[PDB]
Amino acid sequence: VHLTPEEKSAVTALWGKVNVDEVGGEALGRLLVVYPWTQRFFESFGDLSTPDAVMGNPKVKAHGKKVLGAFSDGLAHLDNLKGTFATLSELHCDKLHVDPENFRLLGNVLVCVLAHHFGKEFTPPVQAAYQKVVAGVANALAHKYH
Amino acid sequence: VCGKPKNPAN
Amino acid sequence: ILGGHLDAKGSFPWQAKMVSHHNLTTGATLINEQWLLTTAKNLFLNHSENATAKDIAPTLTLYVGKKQLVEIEKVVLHPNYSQVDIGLIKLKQKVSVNERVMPICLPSKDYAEVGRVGYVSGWGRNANFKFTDHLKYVMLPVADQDQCIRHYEGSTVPEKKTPKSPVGVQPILNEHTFCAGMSKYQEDTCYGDAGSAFAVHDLEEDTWYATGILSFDKSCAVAEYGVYVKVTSIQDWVQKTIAE
Amino acid sequence: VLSPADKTNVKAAWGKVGAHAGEYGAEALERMFLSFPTTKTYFPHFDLSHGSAQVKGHGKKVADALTNAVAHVDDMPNALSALSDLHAHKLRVDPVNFKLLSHCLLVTLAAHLPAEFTPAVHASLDKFLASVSTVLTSKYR
Amino acid sequence: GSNLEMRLTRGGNMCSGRIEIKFQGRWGTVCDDNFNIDHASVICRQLECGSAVSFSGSSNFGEGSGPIWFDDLICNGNESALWNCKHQGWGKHNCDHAEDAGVICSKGADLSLRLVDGVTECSGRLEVRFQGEWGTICDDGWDSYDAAVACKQLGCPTAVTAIGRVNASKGFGHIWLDSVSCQGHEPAIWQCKHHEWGKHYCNHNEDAGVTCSDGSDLELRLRGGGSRCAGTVEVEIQRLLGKVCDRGWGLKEADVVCRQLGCGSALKTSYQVYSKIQATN
Numbered sequence: 001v002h003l004t005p006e007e008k009s010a011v012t013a014l015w016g017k018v019n020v021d022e023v024g025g026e027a028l029g030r031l032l033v034v035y036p037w038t039q040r041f042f043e044s045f046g047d048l049s050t051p052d053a054v055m056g057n058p059k060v061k062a063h064g065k066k067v068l069g070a071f072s073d074g075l076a077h078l079d080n081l082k083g084t085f086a087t088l089s090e091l092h093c094d095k096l097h098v099d100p101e102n103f104r105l106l107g108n109v110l111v112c113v114l115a116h117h118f119g120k121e122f123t124p125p126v127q128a129a130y131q132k133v134v135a136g137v138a139n140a141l142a143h144k145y146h
Numbered sequence: 147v148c149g150k151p152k153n154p155a156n
Numbered sequence: 157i158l159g160g161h162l163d164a165k166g167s168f169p170w171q172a173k174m175v176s177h178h179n180l181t182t183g184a185t186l187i188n189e190q191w192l193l194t195t196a197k198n199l200f201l202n203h204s205e206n207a208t209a210k211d212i213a214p215t216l217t218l219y220v221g222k223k224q225l226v227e228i229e230k231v232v233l234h235p236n237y238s239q240v241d242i243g244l245i246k247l248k249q250k251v252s253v254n255e256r257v258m259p260i261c262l263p264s265k266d267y268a269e270v271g272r273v274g275y276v277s278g279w280g281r282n283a284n285f286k287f288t289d290h291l292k293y294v295m296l297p298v299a300d301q302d303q304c305i306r307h308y309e310g311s312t313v314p315e316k317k318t319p320k321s322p323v324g325v326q327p328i329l330n331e332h333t334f335c336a337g338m339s340k341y342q343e344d345t346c347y348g349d350a351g352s353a354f355a356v357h358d359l360e361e362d363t364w365y366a367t368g369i370l371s372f373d374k375s376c377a378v379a380e381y382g383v384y385v386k387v388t389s390i391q392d393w394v395q396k397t398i399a400e
Numbered sequence: 401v402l403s404p405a406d407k408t409n410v411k412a413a414w415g416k417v418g419a420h421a422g423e424y425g426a427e428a429l430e431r432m433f434l435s436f437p438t439t440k441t442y443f444p445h446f447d448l449s450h451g452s453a454q455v456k457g458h459g460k461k462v463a464d465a466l467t468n469a470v471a472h473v474d475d476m477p478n479a480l481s482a483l484s485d486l487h488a489h490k491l492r493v494d495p496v497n498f499k500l501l502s503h504c505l506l507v508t509l510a511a512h513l514p515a516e517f518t519p520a521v522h523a524s525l526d527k528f529l530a531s532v533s534t535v536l537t538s539k540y541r
Numbered sequence: 542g543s544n545l546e547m548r549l550t551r552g553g554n555m556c557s558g559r560i561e562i563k564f565q566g567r568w569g570t571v572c573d574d575n576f577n578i579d580h581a582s583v584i585c586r587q588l589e590c591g592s593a594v595s596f597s598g599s600s601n602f603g604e605g606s607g608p609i610w611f612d613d614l615i616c617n618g619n620e621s622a623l624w625n626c627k628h629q630g631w632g633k634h635n636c637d638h639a640e641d642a643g644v645i646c647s648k649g650a651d652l653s654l655r656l657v658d659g660v661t662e663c664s665g666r667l668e669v670r671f672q673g674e675w676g677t678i679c680d681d682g683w684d685s686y687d688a689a690v691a692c693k694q695l696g697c698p699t700a701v702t703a704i705g706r707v708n709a710s711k712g713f714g715h716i717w718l719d720s721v722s723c724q725g726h727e728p729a730i731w732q733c734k735h736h737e738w739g740k741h742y743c744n745h746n747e748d749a750g751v752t753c754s755d756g757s758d759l760e761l762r763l764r765g766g767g768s769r770c771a772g773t774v775e776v777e778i779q780r781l782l783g784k785v786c787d788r789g790w791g792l793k794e795a796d797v798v799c800r801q802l803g804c805g806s807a808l809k810t811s812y813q814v815y816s817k818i819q820a821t822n
């Protein structure tokens with residue numbers, strides 16, 4: 001969707017400081033922990049039952065990394081959203097048939113992990129902007145379902 | 147008829 | 157349905173999505189070439205108990221298959237509607253049977269015992285409490301009837317009955333109902349999932365029977381057992397009705 | 401489904417919130433009008449501006465309701481019955497909104513109380529607000 | 542009587558559990574309807590298990606199975622056996638197995654009270670030994686009457702009794718008693734009213750503690766306000782220095798401290814900067 005310059009500016013400036021080797025994996029393993037039925041898709045990793053196993057298992061953060069990157073690529077060019085996730089959308093929707101609502105849940109746990117790290121400096125307007133972002137992402141990723 | 151979906155779940 | 161199992165193939169061709177007058181999406185299942193079961197409850201949304209069939213029939217909108225709109229002639233209510241929660245919808249014409257659209261067989265045998273597992277489809281809400289954009293489905297085991305009774309109310313013996321229901325409203329629990337347990341991953345069935353059939357696939361003779369229809373769809377996250385009204389118990393009633 | 405573990409966790413975490421429960425309740429409300437303007441259509445006559453006293457007090461109310469619920473949590477729906485009927489019937493609030501406010505309340509509480517939000521708690525907190533928002537919604541028809 | 546057997550089941554020992562009666566070779570249970578301490582006293586005597594200590598519903602030992610043998614029992618508590626109390630007859634009940642009564646007897650319960658990490662042997666975090674294991678108690682509803690009973694049992698002065706944990710660590714393991722509400726005349730804490738054993742919502746941050754004092758070791762002073770009548774409120778309890786938190790601190794509390802200290806009335810709780818003495822935990 002269209003976005004006014006100071007949201008995108010606060011977004012990118014904030015996104016610079018985001019640690020790219022941890023945050024994504026923490027959002028992913030947190031989605032796994034809070035809504036354990038997604039473990040169904042990832043259980044090739046190992047024991048996902050307790051939160052400590054999840055937090056330790058190197059393949060959880062290994063996957064999260066690729067997902068966090070893919071989202072960085074989304075946030076980079078937000079005007080052409082359809083094309084960037086078109087292939088990921090084929091992977092998830094046609095072969096896996098992940099229900100697209102857990103995408104937004106993940107985007108929310110992401111913003112949550114963001115807020116967890118960034119405390120008071122992650123403000124309601126900047127959050128509302130990232131919500132807009134993870135929305136546009138969830139939509140573009142879900143576009144081939146209709 | 148019973149029991150014949152063109153593509154069942156399995 | 158809040159959790160997963162996206163319906164990729166359309167393995168459940170008898171599932172119809174009927175929307176009431178105020179845009180409330182609800183389940184109904186196609187029980188034969190001219191008829192579909194549903195619940196009295198589902199039928200009664202946005203209408204008074206005073207309302208009769210002639211009043212209710214034009215209000216509803218019904219959808220089969222993908223968008224496929226089948227029209228609807230009359231409506232008939234179970235004589236025990238307030239106890240046995242079941243309607244019947246008769247479709248104005250026949251539906252073309254094919255891979256995605258086809259009625260389900262009513263079971264002769266009774267698979268109500270614990271240890272069996274079943275498959276419930278649904279158009280209901282999910283964990284964002286949004287009406288789902290695409291039909292989904294879930295597998296559920298069947299649950300000990302006594303554990304379920306003691307769960308929703310307090311009693312067994314009817315004088316000790318009190319409203320113990322985790323939600324506001326009390327479900328109907330009698331000898332014409334059975335309870336299905338919670339999922340393996342704690343998935344369950346929510347608003348909009350009433351009227352969908354609890355369909356058990358019989359592997360030896362390879363047929364999918366509708367053993368029950370979902371009555372109480374309020375349980376969602378909070379209430380450990382969904383509860384269905386056995387279809388077998390309305391067996392001899394539905395046949396009588398089909399003749400008219 | 402709120403196991404003993406969850407319940408304990410939710411109590412221990414919501415205690416450490418204490419008297420700040422009110423202002424978070426209000427901060428959360430602010431976010432929804434800023435994040436999801438459609439919820440504003442339920443509050444026509446309210447002053448929606450930043451830190452509005454009206455907002456601050458309504459937030460103190462929702463906060464105190466929640467504290468009441470968690471004080472005796474093993475039967476919540478009796479305690480919350482009058483709010484069940486208040487939001488369900490009179491106000492006719494569309495059930496997505498409770499899940500909205502639930503999530504705003506979790507982000508806000510997260511932001512302000514970093515040390516206690518280990519995943520187990522984020523879990524049982526989301527379950528707790530689920531169970532409540534249901535009980536308020538569950539008399540819908 | 543040769544075909545009548547009694548046992549307690551699932552209470553970790555032979556003196557605690559759901560009531561099971563063997564009759565004509567089948568075990569069955571007893572309903573908790575009108576069940577009371579006199580029934581348990583009969584049972585604990587019959588099993589030579591000592592005095593009755595606790596009764597509870599099915600929640601603690603789980604649901605039984607089979608026939609319910611007895612319901613609405615009326616014992617006076619002096620009968621030599623439970624099946625000699627007046628009853629409506631074998632197998633007459635309105636109960637389900639979720640209403641199966643259970644008991645805990647004193648020889649199967651094993652109770653002891655101790656203080657841990659106290660300033661004295663009669664202050665500290667309160668721990669109860671139950672069936673051989675020690676655990677702490679949560680502070681929910683813990684009041685001065687409970688502390689007074691504990692202090693009396695330890696033989697310490699009971700003129701002043703504080704709640705809370707001074708130098709006491711957080712407990713671990715079981716929380717045995719919750720929401721204790723005693724009247725103060727009971728000779729021991731486990732005969733006051735409490736919820737069912739081991740069912741709790743407390744965490745070890747909410748562990749109850751006590752300090753029992755005769756009042757001679759309680760000092761109050763103001764420090765750092767330039768005089769003895771202005772400053773931070775410092776307290777000395779059992780030779781431990783600490784400070785009063787301002788949460789709930791109003792003009793009434795300050796006026797009480799100044800009046801008790803002969804400093805007149807509280808005018809105002811303010812800043813006056815200073816070199817104040819630091820710090821406490």
Ligand code: HEM
Nearest residue numbers: 038041042066067070071088092096098102103104106141
């Ligand atoms: C909405 C934001 C999402 C993004 C940006 C994303 C991105 C990615 C990426 C980058 C990969 C790795 C592709 C590769 O190796 O080249 C992947 C794989 C995968 N995605 Fe996601 N994903 C998202 C949501 C989800 C969710 C929520 C699920 C399931 C709950 C899911 C299911 C999967 C699975 C199962 C794989 C592994 C496929 C395999 O290795 O066989 N996707 N995704």
Ligand code: HEM
Nearest residue numbers: 439442443461462465466483487491493497498501532533
């Ligand atoms: C966790 C779920 C919720 C809780 C605990 C809650 C709590 C409360 C409380 C305590 C009141 C005041 C009751 C009274 O004054 O008698 C109230 C009123 C109200 N609630 Fe909520 N509420 C919830 C969800 C919602 C949501 C999601 C919305 C809309 C987005 C909403 C809209 C309203 C409105 C419009 C009022 C009336 C305000 C007024 O006119 O004073 N409620 N709610």
Ligand SMILES: *[C@@H]1O[C@H](CO)[C@@H](O)[C@H](O)[C@H]1NC(C)=O
Nearest residue numbers: 176177178179201202203541
């Ligand atoms: C639904 O029920 C309400 C409550 O009586 C009624 O006023 C309304 O007309 C009905 N229909 C719609 C579409 O809301």
Ligand SMILES: *[C@@H]1O[C@H](CO)[C@@H](O)[C@H](O)[C@H]1NC(C)=O
Nearest residue numbers: 175176177178179180181287
């Ligand atoms: C809700 O129903 C009204 C009245 O029939 C209609 O105008 C509107 O389009 C419906 N909304 C949806 C989302 O179906």
Ligand SMILES: *[C@@H]1O[C@H](CO)[C@@H](O)[C@H](O)[C@H]1NC(C)=O
Nearest residue numbers: 234235236237238239240393
């Ligand atoms: C409805 O219940 C009543 C009361 O038991 C019974 O007499 C009647 O036959 C029931 N209806 C049908 C169609 O069986």
Ligand SMILES: *[C@@H]1O[C@H](CO)[C@@H](O)[C@H](O)[C@H]1NC(C)=O
Nearest residue numbers: 658660707708709780781782
């Ligand atoms: C309190 O602090 C330590 C740690 O428990 C303890 O050894 C000490 O005796 C106590 N304080 C005093 C003043 O005795």
Ligand SMILES: [Ca+2]
Nearest residue numbers: 574612613635
């Ligand atoms: Ca009785």
Ligand SMILES: [Ca+2]
Nearest residue numbers: 682684721722
């Ligand atoms: Ca007390």
